[PDB]
Amino acid sequence: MEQRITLKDYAMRFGQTKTAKDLGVYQSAINKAIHAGRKIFLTINADGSVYAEEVKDGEVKPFPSNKKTTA
Known about the structure:
early protein, viral latency
């Protein structure tokens, strides 16, 4: 649905530095979450937005995720 491209494939169609500056994380944490062997899918509004949707058989998270409670 929508532009739900993967985290890896997506980067291949655009670039590793673009998918990195898109989520707002370091370029290293990218090549590791992608060159490693994960399985995520970002849903882009198509207007250029980004909705990271990771799904690691056990819990799906946005990442970067939020949690202003015990911190």
